[PDB]
Ligand binder design. Structure first.
Ligand SMILES: Nc1nc2c(ncn2[C@@H]2O[C@H](COP(=O)(O)OP(=O)(O)OP(=O)(O)O)[C@@H](O)[C@H]2O)c(=O)[nH]1
Ligand SMILES: [K+]
Ligand SMILES: [Mg+2]
Lengths: 69, 65, 116, 194, 61
RNA sequence: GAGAACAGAAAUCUCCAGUAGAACAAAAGGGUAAAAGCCCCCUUGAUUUUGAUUUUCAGUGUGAAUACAAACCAUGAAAGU
C-alpha cells in the first residue's frame, strides 16, 4: 500500500508483487454430485437465527415491538 | 399457613380458589388470569417491587429494585 | 353397538388412561376440569384425615439453604461499550403511534437515564 | 500519485464475507496465451484493479472500536479497529450433514403422556439430618453408598426363612444397586436400538 | 391482530373503560350482535365488571 | 548384553544398544516418544448465571428443562488449552 494523494488518507494505492506459485491448470476430468446430495450439502441449520414474525420488530433498545394496522 | 381458602358460588359450596397470604414478587409484564381460570391469587397490596438491602462491606443500606 | 364401545374407539384412533378420559376429553383436559371440584378434604368414619385439602397440607417443611459459591458471584454485568450503545440508543428512538410494547428489555436504567 | 478509481465496463460483484471479488469482463486469448510475453503484465494489471476495488469496499465497510484495555479476554483492544464483514454470499457444500433430530425415548413419550415436567436440577448436595453436614447424594463420597460403610446393620425380618440370610446386607444392597445400573444401561441400549 | 400478536398467551382480555354513559356496554353488545350487557340512557347502569366471550381466544370485560 | 554378598530362570542398583516390538484407545491401508505413556504441582468449581435467540411444557404465561452463544472459572511465564 502507498499514499494516493487523490483518495485522501483513507484509500491507499495498492500494488501487487507476485510471490508464487504461478500455475496453469488444464481441466482434465470431472465428477459431479447427485442433486439430492447437492441439496443435503446445501441445507442450513437455522437453529441459531431468530424466527421471523410479521409485524414484530426489535428496536435499538432491545424492546420487542408489535405493529398495529 | 401459606394459603387461604376462598369459597365461590352463591351458597359458597365450592372451595377450589387459594389466596397467598405472604408478600410476593410477580415480576415484569404481569397480567391477572381470567377469574374463571384463576386458582392462585396474589393480591396487589401484597406485591413487592423493592427492598432495603444492607451491604456488609461499607456498612450502608440502599433501597433497591 | 360394538363399534360405539370405548374399547373400539381406541382401536380406531393401560394404566396411563385416567377416569373420565373419553372421546371429548384427554387426560390433561380431565385433570383441568377436575380442578373445579378438586379442593375438598377426605375424612373417614372415625374422623381421621384420609387426604388433606389441596394446597392445605399441614406438614412443616425443612427450610434450608445449602452453602454454595453461586450465591456470591455477580449475576448481571454490562460492558462500557454496551452502556455507551444503550445510552446513545436512548434518545434516537422515534416512537410510532401504531407500535405497541410487547416485552421490555431488562437494562440498568439507573445507569442509562443520564440527562444533561 | 496514481489514481485509486478503477473504472470497469461490466460491474463487478463482491462477497466481502469470503473477501472475494468477481469480475465477468471480456478476456482475450491472445494476451493470455503462453505465446505472449506480456501475459504476466496483463494478469497483474487485471488482478491489481480487482484488488483495488475489493480494498475500497473493505475500507468503506463499517468499523468496530472498543474501550477495553489489553490483557483482557476478547482479543480486541482500544487501539484496534476491526472491519465488520457481512455474512458470506457464496454458497458452499458442507463437510457433514446436519445433526438429525433424535426420536423420543420411551421415558420421554411416557412423560409427555402423563404430564411429567423435567426436574429443576439445582445441585447434587442434600442435607443429612443424622449429622450436621451437606453431602453429595451420589458419586464420589456420595450418600447413596453409606450403607456399605455403616458400622451396624439390623437384619430384616423378611429375609429369615430363606437361604439368603447368611449374606451380608451390604453385599445384597450393592448387588441390587449394580442390577439397577445394568437395567438402566439395557434400557438405554434398547432405546438406541429403537 | 392483537390476538395474533399475543398468540402465545392462549387468550387475551380487552377491558372497556371510560366515562359513564359513553357506550361501553353498547359497543360490547354490538361486537357480540346480541344484548349481553344491560344498557340504559341513565348513567351508572353497569355497576360491576362482566366477562363476555367474543371468540375462543378473545374476552371482553 | 554385561557388572554388583544373600539373589538361582524371577527381587534391587549401574552402564550401552534400544522406532516403540512397552501402555492407552480404536479395530489404519500413516493414532501417541522432550507424548496422548509413567511421576510431581495447582484446582474439588463443573449440576456457574445471563440471554428480546432454538424446541417442549404450564391455568403458577418475565418460570423450568432444552440447544446455542456470551460473561466467568481452572491452569500456565506466555502462546494458549
Ligand atoms: N346515538 C348513539 N347513542 C348511543 C351510542 N352508543 C350508546 N348510545 C346510547 O347511550 C346510552 C348509554 O348507553 P350505555 O351502553 O349504557 O353506556 P355505558 O358507558 O355502558 O354507561 P353505564 O353502563 O351506565 O356506565 C344508551 O342509551 C345508548 O342507547 C351510539 O353509538 N350512538
Ligand atoms: K347507562
Ligand atoms: Mg354499561
Amino acid at each position: 500500500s502507498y499514499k494516493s494523494d487523490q483518495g485522501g488518507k483513507r484509500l491507499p494505492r495498492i500494488e501487487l508483487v507476485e510471490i508464487g506459485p504461478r500455475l496453469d491448470f488444464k481441466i482434465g476430468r470431472i465428477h459431479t454430485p447427485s442433486p439430492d446430495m447437492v441439496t443435503e450439502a446445501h441445507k442450513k441449520p437455522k437453529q441459531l437465527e431468530m424466527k421471523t414474525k410479521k409485524n414484530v420488530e426489535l428496536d435499538i433498545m432491545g424492546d420487542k415491538l408489535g405493529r398495529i394496522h | 399457613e401459606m394459603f387461604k381458602v376462598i369459597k365461590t358460588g352463591k351458597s359458597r359450596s365450592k372451595s377450589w380458589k387459594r389466596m397467598i397470604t405472604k408478600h410476593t414478587f410477580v415480576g415484569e409484564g404481569f397480567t391477572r388470569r381470567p377469574v374463571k381460570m384463576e386458582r392462585i391469587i396474589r393480591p396487589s397490596a401484597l406485591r413487592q417491587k423493592k427492598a432495603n438491602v444492607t451491604h456488609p462491606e461499607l456498612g450502608v443500606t440502599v433501597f433497591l429494585p | 353397538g360394538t363399534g360405539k364401545k370405548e374399547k373400539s374407539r381406541r382401536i380406531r384412533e393401560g394404566n396411563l388412561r385416567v377416569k373420565g378420559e373419553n372421546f371429548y376429553r384427554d387426560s390433561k383436559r380431565v385433570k383441568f376440569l377436575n380442578m373445579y371440584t378438586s379442593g375438598k378434604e377426605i375424612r373417614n368414619k372415625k374422623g381421621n384425615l384420609i387426604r388433606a385439602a389441596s394446597f392445605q397440607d399441614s406438614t412443616i417443611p425443612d427450610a434450608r439453604v445449602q452453602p454454595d459459591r453461586r450465591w456470591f458471584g455477580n449475576t448481571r454485568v454490562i460492558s462500557q461499550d454496551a452502556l455507551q450503545h444503550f445510552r446513545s440508543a436512548l434518545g434516537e428512538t422515534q416512537k410510532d403511534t401504531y407500535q405497541v410494547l410487547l416485552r421490555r428489555n431488562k437494562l440498568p436504567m439507573s445507569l442509562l437515564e443520564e440527562k444533561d | 500519485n496514481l489514481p485509486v478509481t478503477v473504472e470497469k465496463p461490466i460491474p463487478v460483484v463482491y462477497d466481502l464475507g469470503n473477501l472475494a471479488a468477481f469480475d465477468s469482463n471480456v478476456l482475450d486469448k491472445n494476451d493470455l496465451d503462453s505465446s505472449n510475453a506480456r501475459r504476466e503484465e496483463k494478469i497483474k494489471s487485471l488482478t491489481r484493479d480487482n484488488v483495488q476495488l475489493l480494498i475500497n469496499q473493505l475500507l468503506s465497510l463499517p468499523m468496530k472500536t472498543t474501550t477495553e484495555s489489553v490483557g483482557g479476554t476478547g482479543g480486541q483492544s482500544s487501539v484496534m479497529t476491526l472491519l465488520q464483514l457481512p455474512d458470506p454470499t457464496t454458497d458452499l457444500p458442507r463437510e457433514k450433514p446436519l445433526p438429525k433430530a433424535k426420536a423420543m425415548t420411551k421415558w420421554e413419550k411416557f412423560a409427555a403422556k402423563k404430564g411429567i415436567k423435567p426436574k429443576e436440577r439445582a445441585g447434587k448436595m442434600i442435607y443429612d439430618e443424622a449429622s450436621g453436614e451437606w453431602v453429595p447424594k451420589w458419586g464420589y463420597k456420595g450418600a447413596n453408598k453409606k450403607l456399605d460403610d455403616q458400622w451396624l446393620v439390623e437384619v430384616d425380618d423378611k429375609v429369615k426363612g430363606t437361604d439368603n440370610e447368611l449374606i451380608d446386607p451390604r453385599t445384597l444392597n450393592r448387588a441390587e444397586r449394580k442390577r439397577l445400573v445394568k437395567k438402566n444401561e439395557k434400557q438405554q441400549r434398547r432405546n438406541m436400538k429403537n | 391482530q392483537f390476538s395474533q400478536l399475543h398468540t402465545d398467551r392462549k387468550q387475551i382480555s380487552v377491558g372497556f373503560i371510560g366515562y359513564p354513559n359513553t357506550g361501553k356496554s353498547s359497543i360490547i353488545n354490538t361486537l357480540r350482535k346480541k344484548k349481553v350487557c344491560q344498557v340504559a340512557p341513565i348513567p351508572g347502569e353497569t355497576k360491576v365488571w362482566q366477562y363476555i366471550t367474543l371468540m375462543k381466544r378473545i374476552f371482553l370485560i
